[model samples]
Target: MVRGFYLRFGEGVSEEANRRALALAEALLRAPPPGLLDAVPAYGVLYLEYDPRRLSRGRLLRLLKGLPQERARVVEIPVRYDGEDLPEVASRLGLSLEAVKALHQKPLYRVYALGFTPGFPFLAEVEPALRLPRKPHPRPRVPAHAVAVAGVQTGIYPLPSPGGWNLLGTSLVAVYDPHRETPFLLRPGDRVRFLEAEGPTPPEPRPLELLPEEPRLPALLVEEPGLMDLVVDGGRFLGGHLGLARSGPLDAPSARLANRLVGNGAGAPLLEFAYKGPVLTALRDLVAAFAGYGFVALLEGEEIPPGQSFLWPRGKTLRFRPRGPGVRGYLAVAGGLEVRPFLGSASPDLRGRIGRPLWAGDVLGLEALRPVRPGRAFPQRPLPEAFRLRLLPGPQFAGEAFRALCSGPFRVARADRVGVELLGPEVPGGEGLSEPTPLGGVQVPPSGRPLVLLADKGSLGGYAKPALVDPRDLWLLGQARPGVEIHFTS
Candidate 1:
């Protein structure tokens, strides 16, 4: 059930603002209500979820509104200051590597929040000299424990994932350990100081436990399918917490559109395909739809574009091939796939052992959709040729920075289940950090490259987030293909 309302910290604010928002979370957590399930901290917001039957929303809101403010702790996370990007960053700042290292360690930072990937902590208020932008283009993946700096904040990668932060060095301390009593080593308001290690310090060690893969549902084979994942209505909504991301389709608009084509609602589960697409033969006749950017479909030797409906006869094969400029696509069938819902959301949590993607030869069942008052037209609208995302100024949107984000052009650099990283157009320099950010927030770190935070994007980011895409425009983002140029409108 919905719970308390959260106040958003205005756009282009500072880490001090983040501190204020986190302080609010701490106040509420320390004095939580009886029905409160959890209290999560975002970059500049706090979310409290609770059972409606147990407590009224009015009571919860009143209690939250009256919370007292407190100061968050300052933490110092010791680092060796010798990352792959250290020398370059130092050179860019007109300082020697040692000087850069010294400056980085000199300041005591506050642990703003833990977010993004599990155990990933966002530390705030780095030395201005040590601040640098993220890579113009993200490397396919950044090594775990890689200490990264962007704009005014610093953080450590908790696992090996693709990232765009500027690597400063590595660390040996663990950030997230689910087996431990606390599960995490740091929390908001804690102080962080990077200490020097004697030798080559290994990066933060990743937990050996692998996340459960997405579940795959079976259907007819049109073409020999390649890569696929079983998607659901919604996954974990970890948004308000230390930045736990919402792990849904990278392209939501397309995913929803595809589901509708199959006579499914917007929340139906479907199969998300990658570069090669999939070929599947239907076990039974089903109505289906394909939507989003990239890829094409051939049903019984006939080609069909996305955003339209087609009938698949039993025993016929459906094939998909990479054709468009995008990297991912979605396929939805009538009466969404049946799967157990976890955490009230049906989507798979790739990082969490919640669900997994589809594999070959997996059989799936379909649940017939309930009849509803019908009014809207089928295939409501064609995918926009070029998607435009609206930006709501966020925690780090300084005057000039805000203008820069509105005027910038970003390209899809990479695509994965987690989120898409934008390439080109560096984030303008000089911004402050205040707290973590919510999903869909536009973050511009020191690198000048814009990061459109996605469903799985981290929660407590310390980067300079300038604006967030309005809900109305988020659907358009699903159509963004790699090398697809996009401009932001204020």
Candidate 2:
């Protein structure tokens, strides 16, 4: 009974008339069949969520086919377009500043979808004259309300985040207010218009301040010959509803266990190595541990295996060779590294330029720790070979109808960055619908593969999700490399 279809708008196309399409679609879901749950809109995609128990995919698609399409509501947002790249874009277009401003203001833009970060809406097509490519090198942060144009689209960075879009001006309205009754200020198929400022008062610029700094301590670069190993903490979470992605170590479990071995704080920043391993010369004494793709370590010409913690006194040389099962690993030193915090979090979101990744020859500071006591607690257990992940039905689940299939078993597919999908014994009824999903949400597509959505997944979807992974499962997924086999159950 699994049945669905995907709708893609034209490349750089804007359909201001799409508002009606959504209204009509919503009407179809009213008093829906037994397995129907909810539907949601993305930039240009609408997914129908359904339950597998009562409805089947074929029945759902048949019902959906009978539903009508409509347009969306047009929402106009005032903007005081002023940014560093405004002039640069105008100059390239052979238009005066006034002409550029007029062109940008003239047309109403539609919000196609919300993605790339929370509350960050990917607006529909902009005027050809206003469209421009993103910068060659993206800045680490673009202020919130920064109006940006990339290719055939325009958008506002509701929060300051790393982006490459060509800047134009900024708006005063917050795109998202999670605490408010209506957290989202804009929705898919909504239209927005810009009003030229009549010499509006310039918004005050908020000063950017670095968080309290940490002190420099002895750290070794055991395997950093290429890209400098990065030091990442838990990542910035207080950014709230703004379109900002939390970037920490790509792998979390290794980082967690690494910190565990050295008695470093759980959320402390640990070293993330890139392609090659470097030889580390300890300036001061410290205890350290390694995980992820075993690296070759040589302490004064002796061997060190990955996954164990070690104590190194001052003036010791620890060498590392590039040989591992995974692309990255974490090396946690006793006590955590020190750095200036951005947005109340220490993790580096390199894509948004919040914090830069580690490069070779970069020295970081660390907090001083009290001397280790004779009976201080330390880890003595080995890493586990298999992980058990718990699942909760996703928001798209119609009901208990698909419970049996969800609790069933399926072998992990041979795919890179594999997403989990459940192959149903038969197409379930009313199984196709779209809905907003949280991090770690797993969606069961009509194809039967359960796609485990990650942190980087779009904030919205138009699919039926029958299962969700617990946050604790992220640790297991972090340890999973390609070609690994696993199964899911209720």
Candidate 3:
């Protein structure tokens, strides 16, 4: 029930202020007061998330303000200054390659944050002369362990990803390990020193392969794999400290309803489909239910009403046909899926390489639970033809920019996902220091158009986010497809 509480150190990124924020975060985590769920440290700010039912805002604020100063930890990383962008960066700075490399290794850079991708450390205060803007277009694939710099910060990529940073070197050391006792190598309030290395950088470590056990309950065989079909649960809330995204169902309410209809907990594991639905074959007798927009449930060509548990005998095909109104749907079984969890969530995080998506011929394991009587019917909620998204001003609230947001309808852009892009209106503002981006944050980039951060969004971003959509309304945005019109309200 509690929303969010933010502590601002200053308007802009300050090394001293960020250090203090990091110390405060450490204090909160080391000795969390009642009901505190998470303490996220960003550039010049610290975001505190807690359960309002158990902890009051006033009490949390007092705890944060009274936290004592903490000492910083130090770590050294070895880097081989051989990158594709090294020459280009040297030429741009009018310095020799060796000089450029030396400049990069000069600073005992402070770990300002950890995000963008899991295990990616955002280090601060790169040499002023070596600071460079990101590429006009991001590279499609930057290698893992690549040490790169953009603006005043330098970072090491934990995995191969699309990036715009100017790569100067590569690191052999592992920055993140999912199976490690401590998954993340760096943390806020820590300091890092990069040392030049000889020979080649080592290949990235392979993820541990632990095969899942055969299910004792009914299973589903994927006959037709629909677009972006995934198994999701509540989310990996505890993995934020390791730089992992909070992977979960896009439409949580619908997913919850689906689970409830099948007599499962709200956070139970379920199948989430985007745009289209999958055709699955039940391996054994089971009870299941579906809830969401854009499609209708069908078993053997007959309609199966949503929000009511329906029986599926062995070899029965359960399919979903698109109708209208929503973009995502959820299917829940009587007992949660038998999928193993990573960092306490069964949700698939493609970005973090945590779990695999449903594919054709894949057999999914389910929990063994006897079917209960059909639950009370829950009617589908009507969705408006056009979305009127309500927003709360963000940390960097710009009055003029927000006024523009409220002026006209914004169209959903092609590049939409757990992170949605909206095209319309210019939100004029200078690029601020990259900060921890919260879920549901509506960020305005230099292009002026807004990018609404969502469940799978990266932990950090650079643009100014003038507003955040209400948590209750996030489901509507999750179901919004490209070309859908969105109007803002307060």
TM-score head-to-head 1 vs 3, winner: 3
Please, what is the TM-score per model? 0.62, 0.53, 0.92
lDDT of 3 by residue, 1-490 (tens): 3267677777565887787777888777777776775677877778776768788888888776587865436799999998899999999989899988999999999887786788888888899989999999999999989999998889999889898999999896878776677767887767899999876665664653222546666488889899878888877764554567777888888898999888888888889897778999999877888888888899977897665678777899999988878778888888878877776677776777777667797777676574766545698788777898898888779898779888988898853445888888776654666777777888887765678888888777778888888877888877888888899989
Model 1 lDDT tens row, 73-152: 44446566668988788888899988877777877777656766766777767887777787788888888678888877
Model 2: worst 10 consecutive residues (lDDT sum): 204-213
Each prediction's Cα lDDT score? 0.64, 0.58, 0.80
Candidate 2 Cα outliers beyond 4 Å, as residue runs: 1-115, 122-154, 157-193, 196-218, 221-228, 249-254, 274-278, 291-293, 306-308, 313-315, 319-328, 373-389, 398-437, 443-451, 455-464
Error of 3 at 168 (Å): 1.4
Q: Pick the candidate with the highest TM-score.
A: 3
The sequence of per-residue lDDT tens digits that candidate 2 reaches over residues 1-490 is: 1123333332224353344335544555444576653354443344454546577778877876676664326676777877788889899989888887788777777776564555677775678877777788889988877878887778877666788888888776767543345546776556788776534433422323222333456455433454545667755442322334445655666677777767777668777664565556676777777766536566766676666777766778776676644445677777777667665566654333445544445555456673442213334233344445666665555556345544544444422222333343432333321234555566654545566655334444545666567665655554444444445556
Which is the better candidate, 2 or 3, if ranked by lDDT?
A: 3
- Please rank every candidate by lDDT, starting with the best: 3, 1, 2
Against the true structure, what is every candidate's RMSD?
A: 7.7, 12.3, 2.5
Residue clash pairs of candidate 3: none
